[PDB]
């Protein structure tokens, strides 16, 4: 398309300074002695003074940053036995599995659940029999009145 004339509206103001840039000497004059005042020593230590104080404070307050950075060293030191025992309880999880868990605790699961569930089944059959033998005398003798 014929779009993007942003390189193009600069053109009448880019030939303009090229016109009035170097064709000046028939149109102007060289006189009148303009004074130039440029920056004595006080502006030089201006340029240096803010620059030194902005790092003078930023090395004066290095102590609190460094105090943080050798505080968290000791924070790591007091956090380390916790991390060591936390690392230790990680590996014995798979470690105790090979020892006793693919073993005796499966027998404890078997014996300490299935057998006592069988004892519960016998207790339910017993208590149904006790429910009956309590009901068997109430539902025969007391009915002659009612």
């Amino acid at each position: 398309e014929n779009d993007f004339k942003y390189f193009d509206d600069i053109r009448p103001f880019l030939d303009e300074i090229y016109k009035t840039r170097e064709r000046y000497t028939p149109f102007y004059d060289d006189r009148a002695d303009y004074n130039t005042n440029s920056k004595s020593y006080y502006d030089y230590i201006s340029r240096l003074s803010k620059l030194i104080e902005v790092l003078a404070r930023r090395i004066w307050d290095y102590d609190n940053e460094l105090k943080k950075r050798f505080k968290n060293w000791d924070d790591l030191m007091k956090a380390f036995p916790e991390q060591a025992k936390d690392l230790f309880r990680g590996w014995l999880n798979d470690g105790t599995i090979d020892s006793i868990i693919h073993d005796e605790f499966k027998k404890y699961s078997a014996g300490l659940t299935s057998a006592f569930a069988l004892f519960k089944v016998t207790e339910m059959k017993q208590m149904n029999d006790f429910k009956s033998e309590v009901k068997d005398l109430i539902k025969d003798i007391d009915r002659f009145v009612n």
Partner: protein, 220 residues
């Protein structure tokens, strides 16, 4: 020695604000007197007044609003094709301080002496009296009378009266004359000596060339 002028300043700043003098609407208007800038500065309309009051007098106004137009006119048409002194516009702020003195006698110069007076006057006044009199008075008399009638028996009489009469009187009297005054004099004497106009010839001259002394390039 040459720097910026002042005609070129307000010409360039007025042409920044969309105006023109040659091809203004569509017709050739170079010859038409209500369009080129020199007439707008000599008439000194609202427009040039606005651009001077914004760029030259950036934080100033005088006391009144009829004298202030007179001062800004009498400044900017004395100094059109003059010069500039301190080398940069918006940096001859020496103009604002040589403005910043209180010699604002551009309007209603009454120094045909015009002595104005005032004379306020109050007054307070009370008063009191106590006037007590007391009379004492007593009288007495005697009335030795007689008459000796005679016919042609010859009856005779004699009389006495004694009449004292005491008296007294006393009265008091108090007065209270409260009182106040007031007075408000005023004079307005004006004088007209002859030689005051000689002293009044240059009331504006010594403030107008003050700008030549302190704000404009006093060399060719």
């Amino acid at each position: 020695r040459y720097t910026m002028t002042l005609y070129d300043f307000i010409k360039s700043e007025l042409i920044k604000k969309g105006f023109n003098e040659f091809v203004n609407d569509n017709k050739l208007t170079f010859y038409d007197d209500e369009f080129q800038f020199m007439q707008k500065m000599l008439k000194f309309d609202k427009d040039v007044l606005a651009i001077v009051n914004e760029k030259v007098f950036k934080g100033f106004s005088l006391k009144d609003e009829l004298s202030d137009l007179l001062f800004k006119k009498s400044f900017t048409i004395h100094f059109l094709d003059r010069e500039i002194n301190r080398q940069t516009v918006e940096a001859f702020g020496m103009q604002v301080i040589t403005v910043c003195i209180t010699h604002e006698d551009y309007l209603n110069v009454v120094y045909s002496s015009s002595e104005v007076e005032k004379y306020l006057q109050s007054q307070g006044f009370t008063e009191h009296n106590e006037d007590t009199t007391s009379n004492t008075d007593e009288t007495s008399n005697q009335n030795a009378t007689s008459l000796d009638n005679s016919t042609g028996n010859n009856t005779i009489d004699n009389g006495k009266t004694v009449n004292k009469s005491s008296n007294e009187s006393n009265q008091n009297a108090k007065r209270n004359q409260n009182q106040k005054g007031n007075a408000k004099g005023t004079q307005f004497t004006k004088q007209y000596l002859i030689d005051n106009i000689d002293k009044a010839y240059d009331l504006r001259k010594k403030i107008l060339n003050e700008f030549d002394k302190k704000c404009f390039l006093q060399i060719w």
